[PDB]
Amino acid sequence: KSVVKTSLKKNELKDGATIKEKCPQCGNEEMNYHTLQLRSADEGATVFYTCTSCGYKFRTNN
Amino acid sequence: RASCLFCHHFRLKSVEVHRYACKLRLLQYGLIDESYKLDEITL
Amino acid sequence: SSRHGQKGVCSRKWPTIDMPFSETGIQPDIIINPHAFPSRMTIGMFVESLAGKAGAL
Amino acid sequence: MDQENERNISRLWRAFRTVKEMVKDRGYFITQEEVELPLEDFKAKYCDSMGRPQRKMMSFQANPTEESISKFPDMGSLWVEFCDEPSVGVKTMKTFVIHIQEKNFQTGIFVYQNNITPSAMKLVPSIPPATIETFNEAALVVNITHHELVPKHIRLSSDEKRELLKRYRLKESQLPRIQRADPVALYLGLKRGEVVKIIRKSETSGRYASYRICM
Amino acid sequence: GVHVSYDNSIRDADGTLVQFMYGGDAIDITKESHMTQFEFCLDNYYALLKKYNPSALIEHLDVESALKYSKKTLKYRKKHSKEPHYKQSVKYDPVLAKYNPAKYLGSVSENFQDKLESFLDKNSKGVNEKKFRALMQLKYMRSLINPGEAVGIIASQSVGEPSTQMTLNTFNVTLGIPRLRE
Amino acid sequence: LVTEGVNFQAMWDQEAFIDVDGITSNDVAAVLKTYGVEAARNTIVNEINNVFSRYAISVSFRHLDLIADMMTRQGTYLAFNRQGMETSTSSFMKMSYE
Amino acid sequence: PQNENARAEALNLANTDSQYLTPTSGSPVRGLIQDHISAGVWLTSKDSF
Amino acid sequence: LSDGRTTERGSFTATVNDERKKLVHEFHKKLLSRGKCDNCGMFSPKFRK
Amino acid sequence: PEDFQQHEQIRRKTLKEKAIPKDQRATTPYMTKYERARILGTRALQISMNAPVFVDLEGETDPLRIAMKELAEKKIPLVIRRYLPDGSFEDWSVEELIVD
Numbered sequence: 001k002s003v004v005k006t007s008l009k010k011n012e013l014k015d016g017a018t019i020k021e022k023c024p025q026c027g028n029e030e031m032n033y034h035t036l037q038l039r040s041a042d043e044g045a046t047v048f049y050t051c052t053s054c055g056y057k058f059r060t061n062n
Numbered sequence: 063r064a065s066c067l068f069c070h071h072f073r074l075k076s077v078e079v080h081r082y083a084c085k086l087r088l089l090q091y092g093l094i095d096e097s098y099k100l101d102e103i104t105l
Numbered sequence: 106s107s108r109h110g111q112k113g114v115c116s117r118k119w120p121t122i123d124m125p126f127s128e129t130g131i132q133p134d135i136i137i138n139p140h141a142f143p144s145r146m147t148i149g150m151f152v153e154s155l156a157g158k159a160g161a162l
Numbered sequence: 163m164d165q166e167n168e169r170n171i172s173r174l175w176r177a178f179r180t181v182k183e184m185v186k187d188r189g190y191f192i193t194q195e196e197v198e199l200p201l202e203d204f205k206a207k208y209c210d211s212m213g214r215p216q217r218k219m220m221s222f223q224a225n226p227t228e229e230s231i232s233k234f235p236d237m238g239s240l241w242v243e244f245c246d247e248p249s250v251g252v253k254t255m256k257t258f259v260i261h262i263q264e265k266n267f268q269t270g271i272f273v274y275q276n277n278i279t280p281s282a283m284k285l286v287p288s289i290p291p292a293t294i295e296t297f298n299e300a301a302l303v304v305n306i307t308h309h310e311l312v313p314k315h316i317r318l319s320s321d322e323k324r325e326l327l328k329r330y331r332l333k334e335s336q337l338p339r340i341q342r343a344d345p346v347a348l349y350l351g352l353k354r355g356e357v358v359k360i361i362r363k364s365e366t367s368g369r370y371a372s373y374r375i376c377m
Numbered sequence: 378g379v380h381v382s383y384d385n386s387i388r389d390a391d392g393t394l395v396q397f398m399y400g401g402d403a404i405d406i407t408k409e410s411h412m413t414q415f416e417f418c419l420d421n422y423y424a425l426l427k428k429y430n431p432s433a434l435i436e437h438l439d440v441e442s443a444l445k446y447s448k449k450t451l452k453y454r455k456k457h458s459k460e461p462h463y464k465q466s467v468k469y470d471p472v473l474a475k476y477n478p479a480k481y482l483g484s485v486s487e488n489f490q491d492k493l494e495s496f497l498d499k500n501s502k503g504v505n506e507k508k509f510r511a512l513m514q515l516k517y518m519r520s521l522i523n524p525g526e527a528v529g530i531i532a533s534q535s536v537g538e539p540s541t542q543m544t545l546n547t548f549n550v551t552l553g554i555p556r557l558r559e
Numbered sequence: 560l561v562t563e564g565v566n567f568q569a570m571w572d573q574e575a576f577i578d579v580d581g582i583t584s585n586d587v588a589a590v591l592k593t594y595g596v597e598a599a600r601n602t603i604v605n606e607i608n609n610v611f612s613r614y615a616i617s618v619s620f621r622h623l624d625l626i627a628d629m630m631t632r633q634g635t636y637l638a639f640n641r642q643g644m645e646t647s648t649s650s651f652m653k654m655s656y657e
Numbered sequence: 658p659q660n661e662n663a664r665a666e667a668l669n670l671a672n673t674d675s676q677y678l679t680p681t682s683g684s685p686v687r688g689l690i691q692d693h694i695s696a697g698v699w700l701t702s703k704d705s706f
Numbered sequence: 707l708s709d710g711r712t713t714e715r716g717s718f719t720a721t722v723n724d725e726r727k728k729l730v731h732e733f734h735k736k737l738l739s740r741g742k743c744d745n746c747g748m749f750s751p752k753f754r755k
Numbered sequence: 756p757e758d759f760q761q762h763e764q765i766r767r768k769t770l771k772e773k774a775i776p777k778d779q780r781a782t783t784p785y786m787t788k789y790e791r792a793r794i795l796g797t798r799a800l801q802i803s804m805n806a807p808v809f810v811d812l813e814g815e816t817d818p819l820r821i822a823m824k825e826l827a828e829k830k831i832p833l834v835i836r837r838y839l840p841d842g843s844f845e846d847w848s849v850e851e852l853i854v855d
Contacts, residue, residue, distance in 0.1 A: 338394065
């Protein structure tokens, strides 16, 4: 009953953060990122990935 | 608190008290099936 | 430490004879490993490094 | 019109289909299509002409297969009983306490509907040669041995429990203990001191036989 | 102090049993990494022959027992492959339930037996099989557990050391260590 | 489907739309009450592996089968705590925990 | 250690050579590190004569 | 004892220890609360710490 | 007196009821990394206490590596007693075991 998008529908989230990195578990070259920096500042970029076809999760360690 | 100064037994009956003790004689041996067979004798 | 956050221990006091000379015969002072940078991405150390050239005259 | 009278027979049918899977598993002689007894053929035999069922018609008796008696040397007759009272009375048990004790079975099963009177629970172990196993018929909708997370239990006899406690040089009380009140130990009817065998399909190396004992 | 005993039953230090073989098939994780690399062990057959040297070896352990009782349960399982788990033919247990893998050549859990066979049925080109059934059932024999191994401690460090990584946070169900504490 | 609540007894009564021989939860203390103890064991090795998979840390099942068969040795879901250690034999281990 | 029942157990049970695979996943834990990787691309290249 | 199910020095395992503490925690459940001594009517009044 | 002897004959009857005899041994024929790291341990601690040696030791002062020289050539007079957890055991030798 509201006049703006109160919640998503089952298709209304189509991400596009394509980097051309190799996937071992499903070969989907497309793979998004997520924007964080986890450890204390004696540690590299913890700015993650996430594989986009088989549901594999990836950690950007260093 | 389970004691009485006049009968100098426990407040539970001397067949209820003997029933639990005689199970604990069995359970200091490696047998549990024969421990629940002592409750088959109630007459 | 430099002024960009690159700490590091003085791992080994290295003799100046077995240490690479340069254009002139200049031998360096602090060898820092270029594998340290891509986890850090401190390009401010790279632009400080060539403007120290361009400040030294 | 048939509001409750549609569900209460459909739930009772799978409850009956549960019981003719709880008896065949223990080793008795139940036929194939009696396990697969169709609801259309169920109501035309075990329900009244007004469509309501009577459970007094539904009770029966089972006798063990003599191949299983070659393994369990004394397995008596099994009696399956039902109840047409939502409130089981202590004198309803006295009808059924005697009917086991007089007829000289070995194993008894009482199916009820909502509850048993706790006063009626006093009469349950009071036939010492026999056993009485109660079951809530609302709790026996679906067999809990068909579910994928439960492996295929197999009860063992004396000539392989002795081939176990001598194999691994154990005592009785050193195996993994399964409870008395476990809904699989209430299913197969495990006494105390009867090792059951679990073939659990492990997640790594497939089928993996483990053993477990009832205390 | 949960340790493997000398008959492969996982037993706590006061005798009270836990499992009957270690994890199903009594293999250390530190030895199995090439155990399903059947393509690899075909390639380096002759080198891996004289590492797992059967010449001075196959006369001190039973051979032709586990090679035969397995093929009952290889044939007898071909009947009831289309069955659900409650309808299963429960006559025949697996081969490890009768035969110690440290003693009987060819006694093999039911997941490794079905994967050598699938390798010996699909990829067979001049490739023999009796040369290769020997090694990759002897390598299963060599790569067992050591009777006495501290699998009580070692499992409890397979929950500990990765857990200094799972403090990651929100981009439902409880996640990470506050799930694992429950 | 996913249900944000645990009630096995009412879901059996929904058999025309749910296959009632595949239902899987995370409340281990509810599977133990209904589905025996052997399904309370296969849930634990799933629920532990549902934590190390989302962070992509493939711990081996041989470690988890040992843990789940230690908690389920007495037929009940014994935790690792003061109350779970209360059944033990070697009594310095009890004193040296806390 | 201070006795010869331990000098064999610091060689044949707990050296850094039997500790090649971790038991958590079977993965290897020991390998070059930063520049010993980046010398491989230069040594095993097709221009490196 | 004529069998090998026990010794002279007895058998004591984890599940037997489980079945022993359950009685004693229930034995100390029953005897703590009661109306009278029941050999007789001769009973004692309560206590308090 | 004999209250030592009645105390002794029970033990040697107990100790005879736990030795699984040699035709009925049922453990591995291998030296499972724990015999091997301890047989080499204890034997190296015998050569440090003047045990009789039975190999051409070739200037090898290291007391641990001397036992390895006798391990790979089978000159060790040891017997491994492997306790099965009820108390029974199988007295394996070092000859009849097979090294990795």
